[model samples]
Target: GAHMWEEFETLQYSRKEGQRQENKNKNRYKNILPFDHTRVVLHDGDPNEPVSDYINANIIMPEKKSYIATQGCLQNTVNDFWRMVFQENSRVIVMTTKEVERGKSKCVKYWPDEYALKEYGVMRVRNVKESAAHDYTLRELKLSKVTERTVWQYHFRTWPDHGVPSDPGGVLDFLEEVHHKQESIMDAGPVVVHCSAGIGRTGTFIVIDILIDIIREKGVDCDIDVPKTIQMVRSQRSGMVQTEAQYRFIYMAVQHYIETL
Candidate 1:
């Protein structure tokens, strides 16, 4: 755990254009650019429109790139969020932060409630069913224009804001549930994952899932380097696995899962 963040800090990450005139607030610290190579560009519905800057296509090392790591939706970017999901044909959405945390707005309420329909630009989203689990809420959302797609939203309710969970079991179990559901889809796009900044808990969650896959391929006894994994993610989208605590949390979480195996 020692020097973990130091090593992570040493890795090179992208510094690309992040500012967009349409974004809600121009907080340089929050509105960051997704690396151009791996950034998820919106569909060219209008050739003159600029692509959204707040989301990225993050590829975890040694596997098919399976995630779009993005920021918690701002009021203006909410439509962009759904637009990405629709354009990407994402079947699974792993949300790691609450809409509001500690009385502060972390992410906007982007989805509709059961029986209510919300329009985002040309897309319509209706919450079909909601089922509660121990640490997360499973939402079935129907997104439509003419043809419709069913998207599964796994909302983790108790992951602390800017911090690690007290136990990894809850998260690991939740991941399994989400993964199984995602696999059931005939052909799914990259999973849509987001936290407040889209880097902290979002990165942590993605890295742990990647590590679990690695552990399955290479035995748990195989030398699995955690920092290198974080570096790989950061190369695609800067500032993944955001802090030292989260870096450490990745190991703790992986270790817990390994023990179970």
Candidate 2:
């Protein structure tokens, strides 16, 4: 199915070509939502901590606070992402999958050779189930150290089902907890957030998080230009908040939030 889907990846239609639909070619913005009463200082990047630096030094330092939003893309290449956060000496509150029960060692040069898990400092794995407790503990042990440690659990059926969390609200609620846990971790250091690919559902999460924070700061009637936010984040992190599906998610999320009021 994916193969067939990949075949027609691009459009080849035009009016002169006897096509009914004008290849509108609408920018197909990914990781951006329509304007609303929100003011997000979009930091398009690898969904890592340097964003925290830029946000604090520029966006937040000017007397502002924000709730970091993120999509969970902590799948393969966990080592590189983890290294980035740890090297930046930042804290993380990730919602990643329980370690896969085999053949994850190839992901990094580590002692564990069993499952795929988030590699970083200070993470609280959510949606875990009782059966995954052992694996969850193993993940905590691997991430624990003198300067950095993590808190997590395996209480969910799976790692948000490939980015489409069964309970998005729960995840969002968790994000609120992280945001309120500190007075100011914004410029304090970088905060690493990912699920896999740093795009798709992960991008949606971050975008929403950023948007809601802006709304709370400004007012229920404030709005941030979605295009600007996506542009801002992209300029910093190349493939961040990527894909059309991810962008649409932001749109729907904002609409849903607005309806609540």
Candidate 3:
């Protein structure tokens, strides 16, 4: 119900770290920032600068498989993005938005070109293989420091700006594929997910996936609270599932998941 939404809107929690002078420029949107308690801190950055620990990202499920939800990489923050990926030992990345929408910049290209290995300061990334599906693209990137590790990036390309998908089918299918890939791996880190600002579509995807995970672990009769799941994630980051349309989309997606089961 909108009552839950109203509760959150009326008394939003504080994200003190992001609003600090040192970390302000790292944010892509003025109001969208991660909560300090669960925010991802980069320990490998410059030791002298405390702000170097800051990145516009958060660990959504601290005790779970470690869903690291973050904003799409900015030009200034691209290096930090890779650092977080490697530092977190993340092998999976879910990108729900393109680099640009309506000719406006969303996320900057944070990975390397397909031709060769590219360096992001100390980290080197190379796009090894890419294959496309109807609604998404699968990319295998190689990230190297002293050792090389494989990263699976499932880019859901069909989600439009400021809106939900025409149907929840594609989104569900993409998530299934992402998890299948995830399940096949052993001892992996967080499944890093991001959209433009890392709230709207990113939050939607994670909530749906989390709901799906619950259904799988429990049973069909298990209770599922869609709004509460969003609130849980928002506590880790902020403003996940930002719009009414996305809020509606979660119910529809869950309904679709249940019906298909």
Candidate 4:
């Protein structure tokens, strides 16, 4: 939202790296738009790609971004800029880091160290739940030394079977809890969410959140063209998403959100 560009550092592009140059020999794929901005920048790596810790918030947030395995989001650099510009502190909810000692780890492993967390005023949700299938964890940890903050309410699935799909009854409540928690608060901040690659289940979850807004609060009924939206996301974020099933998940979830309302 802040219009300052100098504060943010440049990260990876949405279009695959070097693919732009290779496009000369392969125009067939040159015009192909490959991003789904609905959620996670489905870049070619983990969702937490890396960029400069400091950023100038004066730039437009890219709809899509590339993944930098060892580093976090390049967009985070810009996000930090915005956070600094607006002085907004971000929070995260993790429910898959409980058993980090085991081989299984999902949401928790992705989190940066306390130092990194300290760089940006960070906080975590407490005593969250994790799926049995994956051994991530389900507790809150602070990027800072101490915190009792709330970011957003969210859930996940290690596998599609145990995910929100089979248990609509529970899923609905989960969404409501998150929403209610955020809404009831007097100083709630913007929600920061992620799951694995930020595609598939991640995409589905975010769209559902918006759909809920549309039905309950009479929010924007964005005349979205699914393919186009995803394409736009991929343009700026390489590998922003994957899997057709995930797309359908979002579509169906939105429809369900609207229909139920």
Candidate 5:
């Protein structure tokens, strides 16, 4: 029973040793570290290129390769961010944190502006179309390397940094829209989800989608292990549901999602 609200406070005190220090330059928060076993590595073609720092692999079971959870792009890491998206052929990007929160810079502008094209290293990104919803902004972006690929960026602007939304409906609706569009693609890559530190709201969003998908595949009546799911993701990457409030909200959001179905 303790599993449901298991305290990961111990992990917070664990030593950040060895290879973890390699992330010193890339990580936005010193306390947040990506697990070495499942961290994302970029193929920047530089032998000395710093790798295994920015992103971590958050695998949803039964689905081999799942979401890539990472922090919002820092000014210097913007190019590396695009390279990962381009190299991985990622089709969906869910940005949960605002660019500026409480007069502090939370994330860098990594995508192209509407009606503008931006180049990052070898990749060029053009915002093909953009539409605004009451809670979010949906942008159709075209990413070009040697060839080209289309990607969807779901900018959820309502969620505050280190805080859950006042209404879960906005997030649940946003996830539904993201899933519907993602399903339309025959061979879509993993959904890249990020917030400021990539572990708080980012992890919360991932777990909700994963549990909802599980209920869809299996029956809702089937016993669901929320704690096990959280542990599973945390095993792949450290600090996956950042706060107890965020953890508790996952149950709230998932329960609310299932009730609607």
Candidate 6:
């Protein structure tokens, strides 16, 4: 644990964009904000509305299957969340927080109730279908503007707030489903991923995915560095993985995933 905290403190980056006066209220937490260089900029066609582009979100790492890490939607940010989904044309969203947890609301309802539709900012989202999976909920949503597009939201229901999951099996299965959905969409790049703070669980998921990818390509016998992966990701966004417990879970999940292969 001492080693983990030491490593965390060793990394540093800027959050100037997220801390600006106009964007202060947009951030879910005081300290957790996207690094200036990697933060997602929203451009909605209005030159005068430069401030509107600010969202408490970041482009995690870099790739064809790129990922955006964002905070759970607040009542005021629901509109911005929808705008982002439309902006990226992202059809796959991996939400790691539940609507409510331990008497506190984690993420506000961004999508309409099942089979219903509502307009958030410039985009209209319809909850096309919803069903329970082994440890998560899958929702088929239609995000519409002038044109219409379909998106899949994979809501992992078992990940608890400020804690690690009991077993990694459910989580590993959840990720496989998310990846399969991403492949089918093809052009819908940068799968949007989020939890409450968009660091702990968000980073854990991404780091695990990275390790899993390494294994698939190089074979499981090759070396894998768990802590180093998180450290590298933190360079993109401050404090990518939050706790030692979560760090440990990342190891468990990675090892569990390897065993199944």
Per lDDT, the best of the predicted structures is: 3
- Candidate 4 stretches greater than 4 Å from native: 1-88, 92-148, 151-169, 219-225, 228-241
Query: Judged by lDDT relative to the true structure, which candidate is superior, 5 or 6?
Result: 6
**Residue-wise C-alpha lDDT for candidate 6, range 16-89, written one tens digit per residue:** 88888877888778878888898888777346655788888888763245789889998988988888888888
Q: Which portions of model 6 miss their true places by more than 4 Å?
A: 1-12, 45-50, 62-64
Worst 10 residues of 6 by lDDT: 1-10
In model 5, the Cα lDDT at residue 115 comes to 94
Model 5 poorest 10 in a row by lDDT: 56-65
Where does model 2 exceed 4 Å of error? 1-83, 96-168, 182-188, 258-261
Write one digit per residue (lDDT tens) for candidate 2, span 1-261: 001122111310011211112211211223222122221233223555442211101111111443223223233323333443344444443444333424332112222333544333333122222223311222232343224343222122234334354334544445555466433444534344443333344445556666766766776674565555655554433334555555655655555555555
TM-scores, in order shown?
Answer: 0.87, 0.48, 0.91, 0.47, 0.87, 0.91
- Give the residue spans of candidate 5 off by over 4 A: 1-23, 47-65
lDDT scores in order: 0.76, 0.37, 0.82, 0.36, 0.77, 0.81
Candidate 4 lDDT score relative to the true structure: 0.36
Residue lDDT tens for model 3, 51-153: 7888888888822466988888888898899899999989999998889998988899887666567888778898988888999988889998737899998
Give candidate 3 misplaced runs (Cα > 4 Å).
1-13, 47-50, 62-64
By descending lDDT, how would the candidates be arranged?
3, 6, 5, 1, 2, 4
What TM-score would you give candidate 5 relative to the actual structure?
0.87
Residue lDDT tens for model 5, 108-160: 99988899998887789999899999889999999988368889999997886
